[PDB]
Design a protein around this ligand. Structure first.
Ligand SMILES: O=C(c1ccc(Br)nc1)N1CC2(CCN(C/C=C/c3ccc(Cl)cc3)CC2)c2cc(F)ccc21
Length: 393
């Protein structure tokens, strides 16, 4: 009667993990489908008409979650994770039907800002629930790996099919049925789940290990903040490939991501205290790919540079997300809202700055200077990550 209840608890953990991963897949599906659609009002290149009045609408999501997350930390610390996860999925459903319902400028602005309001609860609550229900060390990294695999699926293989299903039927019908799948997911989490003073955000940042992880997340995420709104209009200047071979450059860069997650999980189960060197080895190929992209004149080298660039983010963001939970475990009290709020500030400070200044600094100086500067930053972020020789003690 003890093993029976234990198997029931294992089933109750797995049926919540799968539902959280499907919700994250659908969320990144939304974030990657709606990007070519906004400047309109067979595949589609991401960005067009990059100016000051539309890039601020593309960065409205990131600037609103950057403004919300320092207050949305303690709401997850005091309360549970089920309640902010349901609030995030509810306002994400409202935003998803709002994209289908309207076609103005300010209404699309409100629909893009409600996605930031939805992310700033749902994403941090999902990663906090995954880090809560797996207290032991290898299962934490394994659940992190499965979550990153579903997020990389829903953010990499989703645009070249979302565009070609957007061209045929129109806007309204696919976003209505996808919002129906989102409400079905939220109702199924309701039917399954049935719903410590903590430490403030004012002193988490002064902890230097939290600070170096927070710097590493921004520095590893910002090349995909500056290369996504730029490379599509740059392909037509050097080689000028066809439109199928311009928006599908990030599609073969998914299998090296999941193989990189598989590699660092399987060889972090062996060595427990080498995650800092996995992070440095991830930043190595991040900097190498961000240096080697403009040299790739043909299309297949420019695909293999992007698959190296997607390999590196897999290594870094699988090596440093369980490290952050272990760090807030063995150095502070065991709460998981504020430190992943710090992580989301570190993600969003790149995405709130990329699509505003990227096209203007390409038009002012050039694309190769941007690439060499970011590769210079990722290669010079080596002595800063030598501070993590003490987390195994
Ligand atoms: O395309 C985007 C994107 C999405 C939204 C917006 Br707005 N802009 C861009 N991304 C983001 C990113 C997504 C995955 N990582 C962050 C995940 C943190 C996280 C959150 C919850 C959980 Cl449970 C576990 C982990 C790193 C970055 C990524 C990796 C790739 F290999 C390729 C592309 C992308």
């Amino acid at each position: 009667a003890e093993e029976e209840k234990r198997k029931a608890e294992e089933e109750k953990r797995k049926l919540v993990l799968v539902i959280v991963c499907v919700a994250l897949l659908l969320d990144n599906m939304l974030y990657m489908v709606i990007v070519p659609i906004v400047p309109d009002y067979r595949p589609r290149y991401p960005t067009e008409s990059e100016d000051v009045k539309i890039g601020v609408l593309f960065a409205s999501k990131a600037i609103l979650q950057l403004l919300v997350n320092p207050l949305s930390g303690p709401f997850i610390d005091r309360m549970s994770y089920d309640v902010p996860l349901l609030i995030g999925l509810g306002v994400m459903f409202a935003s998803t039907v709002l994209f289908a319902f309207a076609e103005d400028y300010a209404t699309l602005f409100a629909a893009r800002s409600l996605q930031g309001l939805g992310s700033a609860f749902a994403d941090t609550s999902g990663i906090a629930m995954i880090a809560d229900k797996y207290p032991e060390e290898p299962e934490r990294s394994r659940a992190l790996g499965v979550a990153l695999a579903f997020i990389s699926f829903g953010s990499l293989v989703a645009p070249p099919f979302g565009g070609i299903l957007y061209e045929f039927a129109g806007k309204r019908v696919p976003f209505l049925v996808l919002a129906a799948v989102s409400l079905f997911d939220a109702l199924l989490l309701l039917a399954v789940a049935k719903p410590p003073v903590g430490t403030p955000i004012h002193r988490l940042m002064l902890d230097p290990y939290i600070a170096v992880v927070a710097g590493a997340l921004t520095t590893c995420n910002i090349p995909l903040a500056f290369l996504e709104p730029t490379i599509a209009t740059w392909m037509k200047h050097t080689m000028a490939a066809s439109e199928w071979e311009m928006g599908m450059a990030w599609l073969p860069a998914f299998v090296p991501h999941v193989l990189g997650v598989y590699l660092t999980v399987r060889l972090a189960a062996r060595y427990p205290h080498l995650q800092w060197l996995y992070g440095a080895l991830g930043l190595a190929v991040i900097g190498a790919s961000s240096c080697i992209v403009p040299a790739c004149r043909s299309f297949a080298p420019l695909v293999v540079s992007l698959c190296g660039l997607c390999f590196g983010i897999a290594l870094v963001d699988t090596a440093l997300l369980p490290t952050l939970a272990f760090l807030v475990d063995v150095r502070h009290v065991s709460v998981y809202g504020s430190v992943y709020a710090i992580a989301d500030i570190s993600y969003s400070v790149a995405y709130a700055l990329g699509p505003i200044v990227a096209g203007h600094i390409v038009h002012s100086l050039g694309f190769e200077q941007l690439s060499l500067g970011m590769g210079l930053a990722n290669l010079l972020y080596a002595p800063v990550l030598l501070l993590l020789r003490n987390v195994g003690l």
